[PDB]
Design a protein around this ligand. Sequence first.
Ligand SMILES: Cc1ccc(NC(=O)c2ccccc2C)c(O)c1
Length: 435
Amino acid sequence: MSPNGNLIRMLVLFFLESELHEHAAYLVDSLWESSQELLKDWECMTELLLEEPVEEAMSDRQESALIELMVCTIRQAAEAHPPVGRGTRVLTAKERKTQIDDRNKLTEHFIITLPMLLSKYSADAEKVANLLQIPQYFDLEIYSTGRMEKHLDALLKQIKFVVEKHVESDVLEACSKTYSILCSEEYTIQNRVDIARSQLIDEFVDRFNHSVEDLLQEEADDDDIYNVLSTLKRLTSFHNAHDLTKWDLFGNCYRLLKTGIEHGAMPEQIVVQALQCSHYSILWQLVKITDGSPSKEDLLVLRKTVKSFLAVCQQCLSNVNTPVKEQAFMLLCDLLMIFSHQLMTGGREGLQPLVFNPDTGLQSELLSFVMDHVFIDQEANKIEALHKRRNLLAAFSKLIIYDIVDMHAAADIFKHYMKYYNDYGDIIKETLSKT
Ligand SMILES: Cc1ccc(NC(=O)c2ccccc2C)c(O)c1
């Protein structure tokens, strides 16, 4: 009760104070054979996080660490195997009997408790985003069984509160996934969740649309810019896993982008988002046309939209801000691969009119950006910045293999930059071997 509250309050210390476990998930896994009972006392944890102290309190850092360890205990219990990167795998009678029971306990528990956790820590992005990893492991049918409808409203009350307080990519993406999980995976609750959502959205589209109109008509306030980007972000986040096509968002994005090309004076994050949103709008328009039995005008309407957007993305390569160029490029290398001749695979030859071949002028810019923004001259930030350029190239690499860009002009650049490996490599190899 308080005995297990000591063991866990010291476990959060042993993890934070010693460098002996860098990864929470690995720590929990290592103790799991020996210390399962203790590590599945979720009532003990949720207590320590919600209670007020008598004496000694918890530190913001230690709180964050309990939340993180907790989620890792919830996963290991649900999945009933060591985490990604410690695995090997056939449960026995009892192992499976235990798993079902653990899933029951953490669902029955967290349905009640997770609304309250979110409540208290509502403004802590890192904490909120880590708590929202928990529903995926719910036995969601129990939002019926336990007559627990009151608590599902309570999660949704709190998820609404978070998205309304937050603009960080981690929180919103975390909130979005949670809605996807609460939806599809049991009809019983699907209808209730669907409404809380499409009302959540409506409030944000009305807010975005007014902001957009505010911005463009205006001299343009620091607020005008706050409001446009603030709302857009919430919607872009959601539009990846949520089919927001019914709200014509592509329209206002396309205006913001067009205003930022024209008068050259659109803030860099508005543009990047405005893009990423448009792109999600387009992918969703495509799916409805793939799975439907679509008409001639249908194809030709989406086509006109795609060709107008491919031009925006191309144009946005010229934007001063390199975050824009990177996005612009990343979408160009995606879109040109999607609306390639591959689109006519699986007897879907009806889609010919959608296919796009990128011109010389565009191909010469898709080379430009590589030479300028992959292959540059000159701590934690830089290993991350590298894997990005890596991805930017790997996504351009796909266009080279299927001759969507001039493959010869590309390999000529790959010559020019790999020179010092062709020209001096052997000599540097055998040298470093003998030291
Ligand atoms: C995703 C995202 C990023 C940034 C912002 N907002 C701001 O940057 C902002 C707003 C008003 C006054 C000062 C600042 C710095 C936002 O709303 C959404």
